[PDB]
Amino acid sequence: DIAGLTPCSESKAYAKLEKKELKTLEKRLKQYEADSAPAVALKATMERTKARFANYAKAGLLCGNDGLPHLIADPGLALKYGHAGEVFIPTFGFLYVAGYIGYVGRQYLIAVKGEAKPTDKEIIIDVPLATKLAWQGAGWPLAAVQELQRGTLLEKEENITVSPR
Amino acid sequence: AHIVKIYDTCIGCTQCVRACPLDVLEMVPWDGCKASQMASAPRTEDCVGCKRCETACPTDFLSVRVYLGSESTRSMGLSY
Amino acid sequence: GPKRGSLVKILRPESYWFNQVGKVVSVDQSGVRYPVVVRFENQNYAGVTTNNYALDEVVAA
Amino acid sequence: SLSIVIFHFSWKMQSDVWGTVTGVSHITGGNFAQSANTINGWLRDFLWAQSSQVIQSYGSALSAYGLIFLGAH
Amino acid sequence: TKLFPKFSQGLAQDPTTRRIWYGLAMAHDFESHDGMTEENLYQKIFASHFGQLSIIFLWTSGNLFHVAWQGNFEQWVTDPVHIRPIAHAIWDPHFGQPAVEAFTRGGASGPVNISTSGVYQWWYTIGMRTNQDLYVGSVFLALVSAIFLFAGWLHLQPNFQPSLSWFKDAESRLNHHLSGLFGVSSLAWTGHLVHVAIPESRGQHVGWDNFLSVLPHPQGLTPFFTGNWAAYAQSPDTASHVFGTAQGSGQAILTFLGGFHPQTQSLWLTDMAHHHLAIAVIFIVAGHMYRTNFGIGHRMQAILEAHTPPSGSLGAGHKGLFDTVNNSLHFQLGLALASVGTITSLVAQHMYSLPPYAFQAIDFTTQAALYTHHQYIAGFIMCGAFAHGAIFFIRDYDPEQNKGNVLARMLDHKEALISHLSWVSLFLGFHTLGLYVHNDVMQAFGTPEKQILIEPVFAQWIQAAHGKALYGFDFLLSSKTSAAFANGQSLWLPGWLDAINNNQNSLFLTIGPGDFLVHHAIALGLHTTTLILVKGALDARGSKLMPDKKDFGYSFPCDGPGRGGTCDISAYDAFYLAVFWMLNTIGWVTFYWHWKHLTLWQGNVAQFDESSTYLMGWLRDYLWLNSSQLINGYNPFGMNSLSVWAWTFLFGHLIYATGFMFLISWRGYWQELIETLVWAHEKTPLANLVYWKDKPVALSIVQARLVGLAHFSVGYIFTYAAFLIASTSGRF
Amino acid sequence: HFGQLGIIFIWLSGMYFHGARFSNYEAWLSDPTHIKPSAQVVWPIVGQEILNGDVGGGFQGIQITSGFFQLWRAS
Numbered sequence A: 001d002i003a004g005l006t007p008c009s010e011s012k013a014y015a016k017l018e019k020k021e022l023k024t025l026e027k028r029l030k031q032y033e034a035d036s037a038p039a040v041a042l043k044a045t046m047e048r049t050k051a052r053f054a055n056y057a058k059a060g061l062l063c064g065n066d067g068l069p070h071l072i073a074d075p076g077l078a079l080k081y082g083h084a085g086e087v088f089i090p091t092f093g094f095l096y097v098a099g100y101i102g103y104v105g106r107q108y109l110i111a112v113k114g115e116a117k118p119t120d121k122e123i124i125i126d127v128p129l130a131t132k133l134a135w136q137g138a139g140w141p142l143a144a145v146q147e148l149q150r151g152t153l154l155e156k157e158e159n160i161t162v163s164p165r
Numbered sequence B: 001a002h003i004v005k006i007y008d009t010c011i012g013c014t015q016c017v018r019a020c021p022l023d024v025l026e027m028v029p030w031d032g033c034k035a036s037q038m039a040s041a042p043r044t045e046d047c048v049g050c051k052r053c054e055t056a057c058p059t060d061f062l063s064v065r066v067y068l069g070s071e072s073t074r075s076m077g078l079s080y
Numbered sequence C: 001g002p003k004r005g006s007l008v009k010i011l012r013p014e015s016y017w018f019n020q021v022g023k024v025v026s027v028d029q030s031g032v033r034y035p036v037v038v039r040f041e042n043q044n045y046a047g048v049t050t051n052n053y054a055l056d057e058v059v060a061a
Numbered sequence D: 001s002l003s004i005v006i007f008h009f010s011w012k013m014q015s016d017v018w019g020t021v022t023g024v025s026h027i028t029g030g031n032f033a034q035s036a037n038t039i040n041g042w043l044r045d046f047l048w049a050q051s052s053q054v055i056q057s058y059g060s061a062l063s064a065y066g067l068i069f070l071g072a073h
Numbered sequence E: 001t002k003l004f005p006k007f008s009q010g011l012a013q014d015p016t017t018r019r020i021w022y023g024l025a026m027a028h029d030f031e032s033h034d035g036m037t038e039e040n041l042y043q044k045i046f047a048s049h050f051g052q053l054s055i056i057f058l059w060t061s062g063n064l065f066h067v068a069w070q071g072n073f074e075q076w077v078t079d080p081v082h083i084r085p086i087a088h089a090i091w092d093p094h095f096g097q098p099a100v101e102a103f104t105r106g107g108a109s110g111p112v113n114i115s116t117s118g119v120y121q122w123w124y125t126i127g128m129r130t131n132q133d134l135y136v137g138s139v140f141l142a143l144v145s146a147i148f149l150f151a152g153w154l155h156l157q158p159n160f161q162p163s164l165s166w167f168k169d170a171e172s173r174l175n176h177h178l179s180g181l182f183g184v185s186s187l188a189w190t191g192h193l194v195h196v197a198i199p200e201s202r203g204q205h206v207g208w209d210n211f212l213s214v215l216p217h218p219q220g221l222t223p224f225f226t227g228n229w230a231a232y233a234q235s236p237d238t239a240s241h242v243f244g245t246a247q248g249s250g251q252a253i254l255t256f257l258g259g260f261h262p263q264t265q266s267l268w269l270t271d272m273a274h275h276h277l278a279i280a281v282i283f284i285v286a287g288h289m290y291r292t293n294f295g296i297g298h299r300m301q302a303i304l305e306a307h308t309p310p311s312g313s314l315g316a317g318h319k320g321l322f323d324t325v326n327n328s329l330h331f332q333l334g335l336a337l338a339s340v341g342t343i344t345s346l347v348a349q350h351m352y353s354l355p356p357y358a359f360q361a362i363d364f365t366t367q368a369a370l371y372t373h374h375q376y377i378a379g380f381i382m383c384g385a386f387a388h389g390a391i392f393f394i395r396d397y398d399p400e401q402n403k404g405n406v407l408a409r410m411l412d413h414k415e416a417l418i419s420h421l422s423w424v425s426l427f428l429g430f431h432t433l434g435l436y437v438h439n440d441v442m443q444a445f446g447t448p449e450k451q452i453l454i455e456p457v458f459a460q461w462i463q464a465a466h467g468k469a470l471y472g473f474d475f476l477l478s479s480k481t482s483a484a485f486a487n488g489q490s491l492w493l494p495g496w497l498d499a500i501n502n503n504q505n506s507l508f509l510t511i512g513p514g515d516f517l518v519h520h521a522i523a524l525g526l527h528t529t530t531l532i533l534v535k536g537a538l539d540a541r542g543s544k545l546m547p548d549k550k551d552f553g554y555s556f557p558c559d560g561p562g563r564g565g566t567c568d569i570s571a572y573d574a575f576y577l578a579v580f581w582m583l584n585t586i587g588w589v590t591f592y593w594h595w596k597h598l599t600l601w602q603g604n605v606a607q608f609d610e611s612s613t614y615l616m617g618w619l620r621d622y623l624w625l626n627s628s629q630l631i632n633g634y635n636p637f638g639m640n641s642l643s644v645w646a647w648t649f650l651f652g653h654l655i656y657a658t659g660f661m662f663l664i665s666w667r668g669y670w671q672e673l674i675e676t677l678v679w680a681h682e683k684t685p686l687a688n689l690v691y692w693k694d695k696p697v698a699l700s701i702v703q704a705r706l707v708g709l710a711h712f713s714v715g716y717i718f719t720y721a722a723f724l725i726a727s728t729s730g731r732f
Numbered sequence F: 001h002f003g004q005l006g007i008i009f010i011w012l013s014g015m016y017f018h019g020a021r022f023s024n025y026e027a028w029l030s031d032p033t034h035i036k037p038s039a040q041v042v043w044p045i046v047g048q049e050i051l052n053g054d055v056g057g058g059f060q061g062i063q064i065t066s067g068f069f070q071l072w073r074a075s
């Protein structure tokens, strides 16, 4: 396939490693009863293992001679070959949630900064304020891009500054 | 002797003199501050650099600093 | 100088409060070189919240 | 000091008291009284030796011990 | 007051031992000397360079001679495989018969070390055959050594203490070094190459006695003089030429084919000739740029000042630079250091990849040693370069001239610079470590099917672009449809693609997630070390905390415990902390290289690609697995050739663990100790008789810090070198 | 001091209750020589269940070293 790989649903190392995991699982399980809670635990274990292998094979994952899967990171490659469900969507989801957290943090800091006891509001939190700012943190990308278009998020040259510059 | 240097911002609060364990300082009459006193370091040869004074002086940009120099029997304060 | 309680902007390069703003406590009507007295609300690296300055070093902002 | 003393104790026990009766079969068969008076012997024959089970404890209920070994380093 | 530190009379009056210590410490800091004038300084550096030249010449001639005397060369040339080279006769009255015997087996009749220094391959490759010639070369190098010493003296002398004009002239020296010292250099290099070596590679001995009697090519210079330059490139060596023989010979002299000689696995001497020739011509023509006393040429300052962009984007552009460099010497020092550091890097990178020495890439001991050694050299060099740039800032800098131009703008945006560096280093650290430990936990749960393995897509891309078609991108060098493919098809692409298709040479190995992850770790190390170094360099002038730091010079211990403590605020101490990160990075890169190459030489490179994606695999399978032989170099049974290496292993461990005490404990404690001690020494009877001169005290803060760092690094490098060599040699 | 004491009692009661409810103590009482003490058990989650070592007594978990078993038998 790509770069010299093959779908995990086809790699032989995949299957032989699976047989080895199961030779281990059987030749460990055969020491207990069938009704023992240990036994039922081992059974559920093997079952979950099978389900995992099924899902990985059905996902069309690539895995070379190692048999262990692999991931590809280029938008064009992953898209032209249907591999967006591995890196692209995850990175975008993380970026969204992280921007959310950062933005609500910035807003809390700013809101509590213009009050009569910044140290106190920083050591002890206003619950109503926290909740309001949390629920309003949603549209943070739009709010931020608007602030940029107004040129407000960046400050002019008035920062504390070392002697040379 | 380690070097010492007062500055015009010597408010004369004597905390320099109030700190030195080596009598390397003393307060003189002055005019540039309301206390009419500027610290004075006339006995450098007995400063060992312990910097208790630089720890004291509350001028925003210090007022009177210490600088390290060479050594001798008199200088380093070594009992032997 | 400006009347007491006024707000000025420190500009002495060395000053820990450089390029910042503080409240003038008072100014000496006499001729001492640094009659300006400026409170602050963020202590420096030694725990002081009020510093003295000459006239020029500050800007009432 | 305490590290060294417990090392002494462990090696003495393992090497010359412990084991199973057949006579007795000491867990290291008594390598102590000749491998414990040189530092290279110490390192290799005791440490670098007995590190085996702790560095191969994977896939077993002893994987935690190896993990903690790493975390502690 | 004893004349101890002469140059420093104050210390010369110090009645304490710190006199001795620091007088040693500042020996060569000629800026900080008595009555130091500029022309003085210059003539001093001039004598210094002479000294360095003499030392290096003596070093090389000494190795030459020791081989020529006690080596196994003239046998070695016969079989370049099962003959290990002799280092130098071993002699010791302590060694028992076991060690003598064991040490005796490996060279000849007598204990000897086995040199792993590649000089054998090199010299034989250049055409060195017989011990006579090695003696000749050694004695001639010693001649040049003594000549340089005499030059040092003669130029120290009054009637030759040179003028500051001839000193500070720049265009003259630049032209002379880009024309003569470089071009003519490579030219004479090629001269020896063609007129001596390649004959020997034809089994044709040509010595100084007869080298005036052999045409190096059928027709002397006639095709050239006609303009037919292709003729000298006809009938090259076959793919069967038994090296150093007339079998499979060819008659071309300046070829270009690519690919290694099939038997030597070492590139074509003809190609080396043509290469050094081409670059010789390029240099000589380049050395005709600037204006010496001939009107024609360039005006350096003119070029600089003209080089200033409009729109004030750089403002002054390159204003004021010409002098701030033509005067400040710390600046040139930093430049030269950084340059040669990068060069040593590239040297190692190309040495392992394309081994150009005859039968190189067989002595894996040689390869690993060479590579890692040059690596560490380069790392040290770059760290020092940064330190010296910082010192340039602290002393030679001026705001007025450099004002407004790029230099000023640097200090202007230093904050954003440092902040972004911090951020990139921090993210690299976070994610790389987290991914590694997730791999490890999936391993320890015995669920390898779960762990992540990123694909080095970009690297495969580049390699396929290079022609290694394995992965199947097949574009522009492994796409036979490529225009360049078709164009350069006939000249070097054949041997190129051949050698890149071989998977046994060190040429462009295959790649995977292990390579990916270690690459990212390397990038992180680089970024954070550079961050520390540059912050130290730039904040040397003035800090917000200490706005007047520039008033103290480069180095000073601290600034009192007030203000909330000032531990180690010097830019000097910033460097002192950067060195640790530098060592960390170089250790990582060398470890990785060594593991992958071990796995290559053995065969189970799959084992590398599997155990190399989780740290426990790294550790257990690479160190604990490869340690078994060394820790057995001796035993309560006997010994072998590796006992010494086990011993050095342990010795380095001790150096390290002792230097720790330096690093951690600080002065006042030891001072109180030594006080009680001296009271004892004088108050006990019959001992007060003798009385020392220089009084006892503990070490100054910086002195202790430096001695500790020394102990640390020494132990470190010793242990690692011993382990590496023991593994590679005792296993191969 | 009283706070320290209360904490100690808490932790002791915790040991005893764990030994009561999640141990193979009675199996080890039946045979000590081959059943190994085990009282700390793990939860069948993302994969940390592999630690439930077969200590004998038809039981799974983690071997303890504290010796409460021999102590209690002694008592």
Ligand SMILES: CC1=C(C/C=C(\C)CCC[C@H](C)CCC[C@H](C)CCCC(C)C)C(=O)c2ccccc2C1=O
Pocket: E661, E662, E665, E666, E667, E670, E697, E698, E699, E700, E701, E704
């Ligand atoms: C042990 C110790 C001492 C005491 C050690 C001293 C004063 C030096 C002792 C030297 C011994 C007696 C001999 C030195 C041996 C070296 C190998 C000498 C090398 C000489 C070169 C010329 C080769 C300090 O002075 C000190 C100062 C600051 C922080 C930590 C410490 C610290 O830990």
Ligand code: SF4
Pocket: B004, B019, B020, B021, B022, B023, B024, B025, B046, B047, B048, B049, B050, B051, B052, B053, B054, B066
């Ligand atoms: S350094 Fe400071 S505290 Fe010490 S003697 Fe001098 S002035 Fe006094």
Ligand code: SF4
Pocket: B009, B010, B011, B012, B013, B014, B015, B016, B017, B038, B039, B056, B057, B058, B059, B062, B063, B064
């Ligand atoms: S320098 Fe400071 S401590 Fe000394 S007299 Fe002036 S104000 Fe007082």
